Design a protein around this ligand. Structure first.
Ligand code: FDA
Ligand code: FDA
Ligand code: NCT
Ligand code: NCT
Lengths: 432, 432
C-alpha cells in the first residue's frame, strides 16, 4: 500500500532507462529529478545558431545498449567532421603548439594507444566481466602513468597519449587506474581505429534530450523536476523518500541513479554497506568541464590534443564555413586549469592554441562545480575497479545504477543505459 | 474494428522481438507461427545429455541488439572451448586432412581474412548504412572468389578462407556477394580477432528458446502454433490474413517475418512491388545444415575447416571428457555434399576427418529441406545487397522484417532482433 511501486531518483540516461523499463511492466512509477531540467550529465542547448551538447555527446553502433535504443526510437547518427582533417595540433606541457601532418599525427596516437593496451585481449577477454581474469585484479595496483613510463614512446607519442589519458581521467595520469582504460579499449573491439571511432565521431539525431524524452514519454511515469531527494529510509517492507522540503513519498522499491560524487547529499537509514561507504568517501576522479567557442575565422576541420599541464586538452571542429567562421568543441580535463565561465581567460587560451583568431562567443558548462554532478564522466582511481561489485550491489529494497556502476562503457552514455536496464530487471525481481 | 491491432507472422527472433515491442505499447497483438514450435532458424534441443542448438547458436557483446536483450533479461554468456586448442585441422578439396600447429593455424586465417577485407574501413565506415559509399555499390558487381583470386594467398590460407567463405555463403564462393562479407567484418570492429570472437565462441545462458520465451512472455501477445499463413489481402483500411484451413483473421497492420526463401507459400493481394518480387524469385543463397556427433574418444578442444568440395566445413568441440567422449558441433555449407540425416554417411565423413573414432550417436537438422526455412542463414548473391531497400520497404499496411532485411548483422540472431525493433517502430508509426 505504498504511494508508488517504484521511485527512480535522477533523470539522466540511467534513470530515464530504468523508468521506461518499469513503466512498460505497468508498475506505478515516479521519477524525481533535482535540477530544473532532465538529461543529467548530458545537456542539449543552442549556441551560435546550432544545437550543441554541453555534456555527453558522441555514441557508436559498437555500444550495444544505446545503439539498441536508437534502433527502437528510429534515431540516426549525425557525423562531426573528424575525417580528412585540415589541421592536427599537439600542445605540449611547456606551451609549444606544433602542427603535425594529419596522417603522421594519427599514426603516432595509434602506435601509442596500441602499446598502452598491448595486453587488452589477455586481461579483458570479457570486458563486461571486468574482474574475470586474475591479471586484471593484479593490474589494478597500477596507474596509467606507471604503464606509460615503460612504453619507450617518442616525445610526440607521449604527449598525445598522456593528453588522451588525462582527459579520460579528468585528472593527472598518475592518479588514473590502468585496468579501466584497457577495459574500454576491449569494449571498442580491442583495436585503436575502432575504439577511437566510438568516442567523438557520431552524435544522436535529435540530441541526447530527444532520446531522454522518448524514453520518458514511453514510460508513462510521473516525472517531477526541481525536487532533490535528501533522505531514504527502509521501513515497513518498502521505502520512505524525503525531499528537501520534508515531504515524504513511499514506495515498494527505489532506484538510485545519482552520480557517485553527489551521495553526500543523501542520508540512508539504515546506513549503506561499508563497501559502498568507502566508494562514497573516495568518489570518482574526474574534474572536467566543457565549452564551445565561436571564432570569426574559418579554421576548417581541426583536431588538437593538449597535455595535462595545459587547459584545452581535446579540441575538434563542430561546424565551419566562410559565412559562419568556426565553432570548436573543447573538453577540459581539470577545471583547476581554466575557469570555463571566465570569457577573458578562455579567449587567452584559445588564442594560445590558435594565434590570431578573434573569439566571437562562448558557451560553457562547469560540470565539476555543479552540485548535482560534482565531477564529469566516470573515472576510476587506482584500486577502484576491483571493488566495483560493492557499488553495484542492491541493499534491501534500494537498487543502484548510474554509469559508474556499469560493467562495460562506464565513461559513456551507453554505460548509463546498461545500468538502467539492469535496474529494471532488478526491480522486476524485487516486486515478484 | 479489426480482430487485432497487429498480427505478427512467424515466431523466430524477428517475430518474437516485434510482438514484444507491440505488446508493450498495449496493441492487441497476435503471433501466428507455422511450425509446431517457436524459434524458427534457432532450435534448442537435447543430445547425449547436453543442451544443443541445431540452428543459430553463438552471440557476442559487439552485437548491439541481441546483447541489449541479454542485458534486459539477465542472460549471461556460456563459453565454448575455442581457446587453447589441442588440434586445428584443414581438410583440402582433394580430401587430405592436415594437422597444423594451432598458433600457425590462427596466424594464417587472420592473414587471409585481413587481406580479403583490407578495404573494409573505406567501403563500410557505417556498416548499418550498407550503401553509404559509392565503392560498396561498385563492389557489389564482384563475388568473394573474384577477390580471393587477387590476394596471392598460400595453399593453407586459400583453403582456410575459402572454407570460411563457403560456410557463410552456404554455397560455392563464386556465387557469394563480396560487399556483404566486408560489411560483417566492419560490424565486428573492422578487425579479424574481434570478428572471429563474435561468431562461434559464446552461447546464450538458458538457450535461444529461453530468450524467445522471455520476449513472448513479456509481450502478452496471443501465440498460436501450427498455423501457416497462406494469403494476405489489404482491404477496408487494414488486412485480411488467411491460414491453410481458410480461416480469416483481420488486423490493422501485419508484420511479415518469414524467411525470404519461403515467400512462395503466401499469396499477396495486391501483389508486392516488382523489387520485392525480384528478391522473392531470386531467394537468398544458403543451402546449409547442421549436426552434432558423439564419439567415444576424448579428442579435447578441436577446430577444423574443410573446403567447399568436402562436407564437414566447420567443426569445433561442444563438450569433452574422458568419461563422456566428445560432442562435436559441425556446420555444413551445402546440403548436397552430405545427407545429415543418413547416419552411415555421417559416420564415414567424420572418420575421414578423424580416422579411428567410434561414432556413438548423432543429432542433425537439414534447414535446407525444412519447408519453413528452405535454406539456412541469410547469404546475399552478387548484386543483391545493392537492392536491400526493396526488401525492407513497407507495402501499405504490411511491414517486413527478418534477418535478411536487417542492415547490420544480417547472417545472425542480432540482425533478426534488429529487424524486429524496426518493425515495432514502423507499427507504431502506422497506428498513429
Ligand atoms: C562534459 C562531459 C562529456 C562527456 C560525458 C560526460 C560529461 C560530463 N560522457 C559521459 C555521459 O555523459 C555519462 O556517463 C552519462 O550521462 C551518465 O548518466 P547517469 O544517468 O549515470 O548520470 P547523470 O549524472 O546523467 O544523471 C543523474 C541524475 O541525478 C540527479 N540527481 C543528483 N542528485 C540528486 C538528488 N539528490 N535527488 C534527485 N536527483 C538527483 C542529477 O541531477 C542527474 O540528472 C560522455 N558519454 C558518451 O557516451 N559520450 C560523450 O561524448 C561523453 N562526453
Ligand atoms: C544452422 C544455422 C546456424 C546459424 C544460423 C542459422 C542456421 C540455420 N544463424 C542465423 C540465425 O539463426 C538467423 O539469422 C535468425 O534466427 C533468423 O531469425 P528470423 O526471425 O529472421 O527468421 P526465422 O526463420 O528464425 O523465423 C521465421 C519464422 O517464420 C515461420 N514461418 C515461415 N513461413 C510461415 C508462414 N507461411 N506462416 C507462418 N509462419 C511462417 C518459420 O517457421 C519461422 O519460425 C546464426 N546466427 C547467429 O547469430 N549465430 C549463429 O551461430 C548462427 N548459426
Ligand atoms: C567520449 N567521452 C566519454 C567521456 C569523455 C568523453 C570525451 C572524449 C573526447 C572529448 N570529449 C569528451
Ligand atoms: C555464426 N554464424 C552466422 C551464420 C553462420 C554461422 C556459423 C559460423 C560458424 C559455424 N557455424 C555457423
Amino acid at each position: 500500500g505504498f504511494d508508488y511501486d517504484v521511485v527512480v531518483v535522477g533523470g539522466g540516461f540511467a534513470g530515464a532507462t530504468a523508468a521506461r523499463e518499469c513503466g512498460l511492466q505497468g508498475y506505478r512509477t515516479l521519477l524525481l529529478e533535482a535540477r530544473s531540467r532532465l538529461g543529467g550529465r548530458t545537456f542539449t542547448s543552442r549556441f551560435a545558431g546550432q544545437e550543441i551538447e554541453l555534456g555527453g555527446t558522441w555514441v557508436h553502433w559498437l555500444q550495444p545498449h544505446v545503439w539498441a535504443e536508437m534502433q527502437r526510437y528510429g534515431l540516426g547518427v549525425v557525423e562531426d567532421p573528424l575525417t580528412n582533417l585540415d589541421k592536427t595540433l599537439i600542445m605540449y606541457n611547456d606551451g609549444i603548439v606544433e602542427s603535425i601532418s594529419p596522417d603522421e599525427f594519427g599514426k603516432n596516437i595509434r602506435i601509442a594507444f596500441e602499446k598502452l593496451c598491448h595486453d587488452a585481449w589477455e586481461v579483458f577477454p570479457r570486458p563486461h566481466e571486468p574482474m574475470f581474469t586474475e591479471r586484471a585484479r593484479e593490474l589494478d595496483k597500477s596507474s596509467v602513468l606507471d604503464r606509460i613510463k615503460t612504453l619507450g614512446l617518442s616525445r610526440l607519442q607521449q604527449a598525445q597519449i598522456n593528453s588522451y589519458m588525462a582527459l579520460y581521467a579528468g585528472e593527472t595520469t598518475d592518479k588514473f587506474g590502468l585496468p579501466g582504460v584497457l577495459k574500454l579499449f576491449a569494449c571498442g573491439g580491442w583495436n585503436y581505429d575502432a575504439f577511437m571511432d566510438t568516442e567523438t565521431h557520431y552524435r544522436i539525431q535529435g540530441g541526447t534530450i530527444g532520446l531522454i524524452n522518448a524514453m520518458l514519454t514511453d514510460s508513462g511515469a510521473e516525472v517531477r523536476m526541481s525536487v532533490p531527494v535528501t533522505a531514504v529510509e527502509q521501513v515497513n517492507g518498502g521505502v520512505k523518500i524525503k525531499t528537501d522540503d520534508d515531504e515524504i513519498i513511499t514506495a515498494g522499491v527505489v532506484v538510485m541513479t545519482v552520480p557517485l560524487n553527489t551521495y553526500k547529499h543523501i542520508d540512508f537509514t539504515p546506513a549503506l554497506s561499508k563497501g559502498k561507504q568507502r566508494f562514497i568517501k573516495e568518489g570518482q576522479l574526474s574534474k572536467g568541464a566543457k565549452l564551445y567557442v565561436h571564432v570569426k575565422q574559418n579554421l576548417g576541420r581541426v583536431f588538437a590534443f593538449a597535455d595535462e599541464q595545459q587547459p584545452l586538452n581535446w579540441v575538434q571542429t563542430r561546424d565551419y564555413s566562410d559565412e559562419l567562421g568556426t565553432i570548436l568543441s573543447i573538453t577540459i580535463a581539470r577545471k583547476e586549469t581554466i575557469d570555463v565561465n571566465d570569457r577573458d581567460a578562455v579567449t587567452r587560451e584559445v588564442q594560445k592554441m590558435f594565434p590570431g583568431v578573434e573569439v566571437l562567443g562562448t558557451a560553457a558548462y562547469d560540470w565539476t562545480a555543479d552540485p548535482f554532478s560534482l565531477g564529469a564522466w566516470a573515472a576510476y582511481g587506482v584500486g577502484q575497479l576491483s571493488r566495483l561489485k560493492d557499488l553495484q550491489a542492491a541493499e534491501g529494497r534500494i537498487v543502484f545504477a548510474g554509469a559508474e556502476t556499469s560493467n562495460g562503457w562506464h565513461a559513456s552514455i551507453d554505460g548509463a543505459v546498461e545500468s538502467g536496464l539492469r535496474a529494471g530487471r532488478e526491480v522486476k525481481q524485487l516486486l515478484s
